[PDB]
Amino acid sequence: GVQVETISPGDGRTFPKRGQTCVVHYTGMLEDGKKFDSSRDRNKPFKFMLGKQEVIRGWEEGVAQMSVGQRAKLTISPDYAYGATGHPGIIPPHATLVFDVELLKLE
Amino acid sequence: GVQVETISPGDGRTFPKRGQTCVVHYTGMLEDGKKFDSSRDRNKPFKFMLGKQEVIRGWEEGVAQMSVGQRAKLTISPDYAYGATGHPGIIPPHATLVFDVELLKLE
Ligand SMILES: C=CC[C@@H]1/C=C(\C)C[C@H](C)C[C@H](OC)[C@H]2O[C@@](O)(C(=O)C(=O)N3CCCC[C@H]3C(=O)O[C@H](/C(C)=C/[C@@H]3CC[C@@H](O)[C@H](OC)C3)[C@H](C)[C@@H](O)CC1=O)[C@H](C)C[C@@H]2OC
Ligand SMILES: C=CC[C@@H]1/C=C(\C)C[C@H](C)C[C@H](OC)[C@H]2O[C@@](O)(C(=O)C(=O)N3CCCC[C@H]3C(=O)O[C@H](/C(C)=C/[C@@H]3CC[C@@H](O)[C@H](OC)C3)[C@H](C)[C@@H](O)CC1=O)[C@H](C)C[C@@H]2OC
Structure with missing residues (x-):
């Protein structure tokens, strides 16, 4: 599934609802910390909506447990x-x- | 994993090697038989290579067990x-x- 470990707390009040756009910054890495992607490096937040198979399920269920302003590690x-399968040329099986x-x- | 059940036998001699191009016709369906895609409907075979994360793992391991001319159901x-996650708008979680x-x- 997904484990959510908090780095900095959110407002503890505003949690994502299906049909809202979540605006996030992310860095993705393998378990040993090897970075394969980051929106922070592009200086452009990534936006997506819950409920539309727009993101891997781990994100759909992990981000739904975070409140606005929160920074967390999702495993x-x-x-x-x-x-x-993995993701071609980026993530192994x-x-x-x-x-x-x-x-x-x-939004 | 993948289960391979044979509809028509192949030559029992020529099995796909990494670095060959496999030329196939396929029809994909859910477990109840609902069709979501078929190359037969486009009259155009689908081609792919083993060893390059070009197809889902079930295909990489299922087609490697088939010989030329064989027709099989891969579950x-x-x-x-x-x-x-599923595949957006086509395959459920x-x-x-x-x-x-x-x-x-x-080839
Ligand atoms: C339409 C084509 C381009 C379209 C691309 C973008 C909007 C740019 C957007 C910043 C993606 C990044 O581009 C630099 C890049 O992000 C990764 O590096 C990454 O960190 C990652 O894992 N992310 C992105 C952040 C959200 C979680 C996850 C994801 O959910 O990503 C989603 C993903 C790949 C889902 C597949 C969908 C197919 C399902 O079958 C499968 O189910 C198993 C899961 C992305 C958002 C897709 O919905 C949309 C796209 O693909 C992937 C390693 C590869 C991906 O490039 C493609
Ligand atoms: C570059 C972009 C377009 C490029 C599209 C084509 C060459 C056209 C090709 C006929 C695809 C079909 O287009 C009508 C259509 O085939 C399906 O309908 C389907 O029957 C299927 O399941 N197939 C296709 C037959 C081989 C097995 C499997 C597959 O392995 O498909 C692969 C697949 C989606 C793998 C993902 C890759 C990301 C991984 O992270 C993930 O790992 C979990 C698995 C396809 C071949 C990709 O490698 C290449 C592409 O996507 C999918 C339901 C959706 C897919 O449309 C996209």
Whole structure:
């Protein structure tokens, strides 16, 4: 599934609802910390909506547990990410992924 | 994983090697037989290579067990396909997929 470990607390009040746009900054890394992607490096937040199969399930269920302003590490098992296939040229088969996610706002 | 059940036998001699192009016709369906895609409908075989994360793992391991001319049903568990996420707008979360695959040739 997904484990959510908090780096900095959110407002403890505003949690994402299906049909809102979540605006986040993320860094994705393998379990040993190797970075494969980050929106912080592009200086451009990533936006997505819950309920539309727009993100891997680990994100759909991890970000729904965060409130605005929170920064958390989401550790996602392979079945909630790219499974036995991986993602071509970036993520190996059976990889647990770690995302450092900051939920900046909801629109 | 993947289960391979044969509809028509292949030559029992020529099995796909990494670095060959497999030329196939396929029909993909959910477990109840609902069709979501077929190359047969486009009259255009699908081609791919083993060893390059070009296909879901269930195909990488299922087609490697088929010889040329064989037609088989590959039943693939979600972790060897799209897992808990599914494929946006086409495949639901946690879906076992069934592919009717004919291995036409290797190039
Ligand atoms: C339409 C095509 C381009 C479109 C691309 C963008 C909007 C740019 C957006 C910043 C993606 C990044 O581009 C630099 C890059 O992000 C990664 O590096 C990454 O960190 C990651 O894992 N992310 C991104 C952050 C949200 C979680 C997760 C995701 O959910 O990503 C989603 C993902 C790949 C889901 C697949 C969908 C197919 C399902 O079958 C499968 O289910 C198993 C899961 C992305 C958002 C797709 O919905 C949308 C796209 O693909 C991937 C390693 C590869 C991906 O490039 C493609
Ligand atoms: C570059 C972009 C376009 C590029 C599209 C084509 C060459 C056209 C090709 C006929 C695809 C079909 O287009 C009508 C259509 O085929 C399906 O309908 C389908 O029957 C299927 O399941 N197939 C196709 C037959 C081989 C097995 C499997 C697959 O392995 O498909 C692969 C797949 C989606 C793998 C993801 C890759 C990301 C990993 O993270 C994830 O790992 C969990 C698995 C396809 C071949 C990709 O490698 C290449 C592409 O995407 C999918 C339901 C959705 C897919 O449309 C996209």
